[PDB]
Design a protein around this nucleic acid. Sequence first.
RNA 1: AUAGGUUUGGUCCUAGCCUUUCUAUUAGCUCUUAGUAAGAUUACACAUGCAAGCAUCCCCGUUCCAGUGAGUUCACCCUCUAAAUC
Lengths: 232, 115, 77, 52, 109, 190, 291, 50, 164
Amino acid sequence: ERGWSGNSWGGISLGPPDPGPCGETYEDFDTRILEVRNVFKSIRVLVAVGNGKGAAGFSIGKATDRMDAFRKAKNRAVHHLHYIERYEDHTIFHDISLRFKRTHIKMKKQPKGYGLRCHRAIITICRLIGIKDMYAKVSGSINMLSLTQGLFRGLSRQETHQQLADKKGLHVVEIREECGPLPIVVASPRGPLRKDPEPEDEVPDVKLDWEDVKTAQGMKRSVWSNLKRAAT
Amino acid sequence: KAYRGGHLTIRLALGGCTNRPFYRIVAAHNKCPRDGRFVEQLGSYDPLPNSHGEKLVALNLDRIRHWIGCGAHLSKPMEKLLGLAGFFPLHPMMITNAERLRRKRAREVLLASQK
Amino acid sequence: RKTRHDPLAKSKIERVNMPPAVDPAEFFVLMERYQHYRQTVRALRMEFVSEVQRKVHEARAGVLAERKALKDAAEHR
Amino acid sequence: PYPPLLRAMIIAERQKNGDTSTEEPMLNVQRIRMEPWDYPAKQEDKGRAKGT
Amino acid sequence: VRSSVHARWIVGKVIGTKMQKTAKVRVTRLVLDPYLLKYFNKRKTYFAHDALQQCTVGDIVLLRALPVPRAKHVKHELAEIVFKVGKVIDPVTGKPCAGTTYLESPLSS
Amino acid sequence: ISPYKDEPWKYLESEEYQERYGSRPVWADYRRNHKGGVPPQRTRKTCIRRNKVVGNPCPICRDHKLHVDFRNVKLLEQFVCAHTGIIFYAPYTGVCVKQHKRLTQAIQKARDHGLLIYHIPQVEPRDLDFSTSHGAVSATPPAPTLVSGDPWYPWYNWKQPPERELSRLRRLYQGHLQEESGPPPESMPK
Amino acid sequence: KKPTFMDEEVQSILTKMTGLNLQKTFKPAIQELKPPTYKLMTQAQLEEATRQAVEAAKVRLKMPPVLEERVPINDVLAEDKILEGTETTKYVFTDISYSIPHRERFIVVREPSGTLRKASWEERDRMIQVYFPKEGRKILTPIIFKEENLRTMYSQDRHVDVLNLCFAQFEPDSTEYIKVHHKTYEDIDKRGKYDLLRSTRYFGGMVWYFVNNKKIDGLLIDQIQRDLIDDATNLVQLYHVLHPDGQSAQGAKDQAAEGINLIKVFAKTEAQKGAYIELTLQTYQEALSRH
Amino acid sequence: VRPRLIAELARRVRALREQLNRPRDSQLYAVDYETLTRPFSGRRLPVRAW
Amino acid sequence: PMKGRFPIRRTLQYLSQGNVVFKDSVKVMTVNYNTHGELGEGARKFVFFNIPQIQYKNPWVQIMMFKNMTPSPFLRFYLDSGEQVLVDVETKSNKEIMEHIRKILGKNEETLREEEEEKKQLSHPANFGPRKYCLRECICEVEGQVPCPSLVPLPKEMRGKYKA
RNA sequence: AUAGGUUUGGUCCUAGCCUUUCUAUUAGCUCUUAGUAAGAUUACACAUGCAAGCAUCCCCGUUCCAGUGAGUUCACCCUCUAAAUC
Ligand code: FES
Ligand SMILES: [K+]
Ligand SMILES: [K+]
Ligand SMILES: [Mg+2]
Ligand SMILES: [Mg+2]
Ligand SMILES: [Mg+2]
Ligand SMILES: [Mg+2]
Ligand SMILES: [Mg+2]
Ligand SMILES: [Zn+2]
């Protein structure tokens, strides 16, 4: 099977990581190549690993031979794993806007069945993590290493509903349009519950993004947006 | 747009496709094109029988009365349609055509008897 | 269609529109039928005109409109 | 008499408004005088052929 | 029905008094920028008939439409002076004021 | 030739299908060949042309035992979103336009036959008042003419003109007369 | 006079018998989805939101009126025999004036024989759908309402879907509506699927049908087995008021039966399966004593 | 708007020339009895009048 | 991101969230407010948050603002009859100002519902025409009627080519 | 835009160009049937034939329909008010 292109290493699977010196096996982990670059000769490879259940990581491997670089990157990646919290094991807990160096990433939580509408590298990493529904837009410099680093930082710094409930000492109630006015309590504080309600902010001072508003109001006219694509 | 003289008339504007006519009953200036600008659409008329063997005529009778009371004229097919609906008296020409067809069929039957 | 400045066709210089033949009985009956039909239709048209002008008058200075106007003015006060 | 459908609507509205009269709806034609088509028209309003 | 002038009542600032019995008034309205969705001031000049020549440059006036224009550009007349320049009377309390301070205290009466 | 043509659903609980696809959709492993990163916005019309399959047949055309039938509900469900009930657009799965149309028709037929579960909303009544007392749905008092069997108006019937009027017309239209017509047949001749 | 189905007393009894389960009333719909929203709430705010949801559920569960079958329309406005044979097909004239109730809307038919008559109920419904289309309604009757397709729907326990389709397609007083609702109720009674209609707006109509046809035994059994004893007693009381001259009501008056005693008198007087009613009631009482 | 004075002049001149060159009844309503045409215009009268 | 503080104000959703639709009498609204002073604080927010919504819902009403001309903030409405309405807003919150002006000079919800019903009548569902104005183009789109010849060829008997 | 290729010995940043998508016209080559829709490049010049009659004479119509896009804030709202229909 081919990667992102016919002649491209990106997206190609390297198989499970080798059993480690610690004595642990990783047959449930999958490896994906994100980048291969000639260093002037040697080879530098960026790979990502993940078990599809929130445990994922990435690593750089440098070697004269490409296969040695693959092995080094994979083995180092398995020992630098992140744990990524997932909302209902299919998406992220909230929208995430981040900037790593000059690369901006804007991720949006989506309902079930939305799929992965993201940069191809982000699609690969999300499949490794186990995220199945998300939107993502990458702006600024599209640098693969910076993209991966920013993505992992943003996904590792997301606040779960339980964390929010414990922080604010209040019920987190979910409203779904498909479920009518039924209040769904997704998280309750473990400690005592505040009797004072949150200030009913008349107008929050939130920093809005012109792309989101323009899409909402219908002035986005891009011929490239919302194009039919294969299932991801 | 100002026309020299002219008046409002309730008439049939033809739409649909080749071999499949359909009519919109509209009130329009008599000088305007048949399928052009109109003041108000007052109904529709499908002349082809449907799966139930029916010719469907929709008449906005409140607005038809309003436009007649505002000085609108009527095309002869529209008068015949309103006569068929019972809204107007049967047009004289429908009665005359019915009598002519009766006489023609009587002549044909007499020819058959003669043979 | 042609304008008044376009000349007549040469193929139609000598053309006479011969009137159609007449059936006396059908002609007379049709004349009577047109008279009666037009009388009825004019009566209906006059009734519709009366209805339209009545609706206009009721909308402008009807009891309902007067009461609504009085209520609005008072409530504003 | 009124035309059939229009008579039916007049009667139906009458019954809806609570009135229960059995009197037929009826069109007055006394004020609609039928002038013969050959009656002299107003020559003052008529036009004239233009010189040419 | 009572006037052929489009602008019936308008509030403006007097910007000119060099014409006889006529005041040149600047009127601002709020117009939405279609792209920025922010409201900006749009200015228009109106000539208002001022028979008594009581208007001074800088005062806020109310203009009422004439039934018909009395000249090419004079379609309005001075209904009243809302704020006389430098001689503002606080409408809430009825007392004279200089900016945000009371010249005569409301308690004084 | 497939032994499941008469009962297509059988193929889906046969062990051959389980070996070939397992629990994943029949289109899960398919991939379209195209230039660029953005695929063309329509799939090919048909993978089978004059009984000849193209190099990369779509998921339906690559397996001749898969039959698009309204009774093969388990196959049809694989082309409908389970969370939204919306039929996937053809580039989503890679089916050709012909098979996509066939699947859409089969899904609609299955839903109309009650074999495929879909969301049926709860609607409000058409009317606010259910009275049937109005004359539009009740009986209108018959007109006197309808009772007596006369036409609605007298002029609907043919009245022979007087001979004097006929002679006057014959004088008015000298030489341009047609044969005088008598009263018409009372009923429509058969 | 005998109570109507819209009587406030009957309405209250049927409202309480239906129940209100918020999770069933607002089950997640399979439709185009949007990202959910989140709110931080206190206990009081959560209780207020729950109460508002309960009110919305009450609005959703409002019972459709039960109407008698509409009488056929057979009225002739005119018979213009002169037009006989001049046309081969009938003309349907629909008055499409906007501000007219659809049951007061004049729809007439000029037949080839020359008769101007009023449209039948089926023609009226079809024309109203043609010119005033209603979401969920179809011009031609869907094939789902045929016997075999509705049997399949019943076999899938989709009775509420069938009733919703019927409500969207047919008018309440139409023959098709009454027939489909009655067949659904018969299937439910035959297979003991009453819980399917609980917390829906059709339970009241089902109960009314069972009471008026004197077949409340299965529903009483189901209520007793689900420990909804109050619902069963209210069902017996509704049966008695609907049939005050029956043996059951007279026996209840004579023995001064109240509560469970009403159920016992019904089982002894006017139950087609009173023995099994008594057995189930004894089992319920024994389990209550043991607990 | 640039004034259009030639149009006004032409309209006035045409009106003056029409009210000074009026055709008379003897010209308008003369008839050639052999051909039954109006010599003023050359248009034939309807058959039913001949 | 969107420039400025509180960028939500520059969205059509926020502008349409306004609930004040003035009666036809209101022609001019002058807003006299003070840039500084706690007592006028709410008035300042009324200028910052609610004037855009009022203008969006009342495009033909002249709204003009004045700063530090009087010791106290106030609103003045000029009506077509010549009547003037003065609303003192000192010590009030912007919500209180909005509610007050809605109460005294805003169309009630019943009148707005009547206007919406009047609008509904214009788009008659039975009318056939362009999608821009009508639900359907032609009667051929109604189930049971003779379909368009574009999709379903008409039988040979009803086509003029084979009727001639 | 879910983006991609391309500056350097190499990395990062900035920045242009181009690719992938969807329409229309024309050109090459190639084209079987049926239904539907649409159809001069040119306000350049035009052979030829038709496109306005009706009707007891008066009048009425030929000021419309149909065509083009040369010129170009004459089209929309309000006030007032002719001609026209009733
Ligand atoms: S658009 Fe209706 S027949 Fe073609
Ligand atoms: K004539
Ligand atoms: K042009
Ligand atoms: Mg290749
Ligand atoms: Mg570049
Ligand atoms: Mg290089
Ligand atoms: Mg070509
Ligand atoms: Mg006049
Ligand atoms: Zn295929």
